[PDB]
Amino acid sequence: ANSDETVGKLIAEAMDKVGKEGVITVEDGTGLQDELDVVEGMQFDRGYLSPYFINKPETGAVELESPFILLADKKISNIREMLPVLEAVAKAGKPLLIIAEDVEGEALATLVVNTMRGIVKVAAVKAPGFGDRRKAMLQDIATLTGGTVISEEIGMELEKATLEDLGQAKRVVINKDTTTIIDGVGEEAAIQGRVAQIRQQIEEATSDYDREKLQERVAKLAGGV
């Protein structure tokens, strides 16, 4: 950095916290002073679907304590698919995080009615990116939570899911831009097997641009960005 001591120590500290797997990035700063922001756990850049879920309006955000997490392929078209899972989760009593590729108006509006009037505590967020890397990252998210990805390819109806088929986390926190999950229930050995799979494909990566995107997936699963 041409004899800039501040830049050198910031990177030494960052490499410290992120770890060897962790990725350090450079962005335009808010102010005159340089800053370093390190996030550990599974963070990704998708916001809350509606502002009605906000149970911390002094933080401007939603926080849910010990939640189940549901991962679904395609669109959530109706509550008509959702019902037995909704009955089961409500009866168990835990809060819930809904991951899917989209949520339809009937589904979103019904979720808002249930949260608002206190029946079930539920947050809903959109899946990250597009195509195959969205599918891959959804499996990585399931490996972290210790859950099952519900999809048509495996032949899993949303209507035939049970509470054994949902992963879990210690805490989840969500903003208008960003989603972050703190400390999975997923088994560490399974996480490392899946990390090893992802890492092996880094060694095969012809596109350097996509190799970086593979580096982020290893970093989110293990270490920090």
Partner 1 sequence: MNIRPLHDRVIVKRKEVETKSAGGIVLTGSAAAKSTRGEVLAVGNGRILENGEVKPLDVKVGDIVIFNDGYGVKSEKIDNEEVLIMSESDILAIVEA
For residue 54, what are its two tokens? 């906000």
Binding partner at 120 among a copy of itself, partner 1, none, C-beta below 5 to 8 Å by kind? partner 1
The answer to whether 90 contacts partner 1 (rule: CB under 8 A) is: yes
For the bound state, the minimum distance from the C-beta of residue 162 to partner 1, rounded and expressed in Å, comes to 15
Tell me phi and psi for residue 150, to 5 degrees.
-85, 120
Q: Which is nearer to a copy of itself, 116 or 163 (CB)?
A: 116
Q: Does 83 bind partner 1 (CB under 8 A)?
A: yes
DSSP 8-class letter at 101? S
User: Which of the ranges 17-25, 31-39, 102-110, 196-204 carries the binding residues for partner 1, by CB under 8 A?
Assistant: 102-110
Of a copy of itself, partner 1, none, which one sits near residue 52, judging by CB under 5 to 8 A according to partner kind?
a copy of itself
92 touches which of a copy of itself, partner 1, none (CB within 5 to 8 A by kind)? none
Question: Which residues 58-87 are close enough to bind a copy of itself by CB under 8 A?
Answer: 58, 60
Bridge partners (DSSP) of residue 181 are 42, 172
The 146-185 contact track toward a copy of itself, x by CB under 8 A, reads ------xxxx------------------------------
DSSP for 120-187, please give it.
--EEEEEPSSSHHHHHHHHHHHHHHHT--EE-TTTT--GGG--GGG-EEEEEEEE-SS-EEEEEE-S-
For the chain, state the CA radius of gyration: 19
Tell me which of partner 1, a copy of itself, none is bound by residue 31, counting a contact when its beta carbon lies within the kind-specific cut-off of 5 to 8 angstroms: none
In whole angstroms, give the CA distance from residue 210 to residue 24. 16
C-alpha span between 36 and 14 (Å, rounded): 7
Amino acid identity for residue 140 in this structure: D
Cα–Cα distance measured from residue 49 to residue 76, given in angstroms and rounded to the nearest whole number: 13
Interaction between residue 92 and partner 1 (CB under 8 A): no
79 binds, among partner 1, a copy of itself, none (CB under 5 to 8 A by kind): partner 1
User: How would you classify residue 212: left for phi > 0, otherwise alpha for psi between -120 and 50, otherwise beta?
Assistant: alpha
In the region spanning residues 146 to 175, those forming contacts with partner 1, defined by CB under 8 A, are 152, 155
Q: With contacts defined by CB under 8 A, how many residues of the chain interact with a copy of itself?
A: 19
Q: Which residues bind a copy of itself (CB under 8 A)?
A: 50, 52, 57-58, 60, 108-109, 112-113, 116, 152-155, 196-197, 200-201, 204
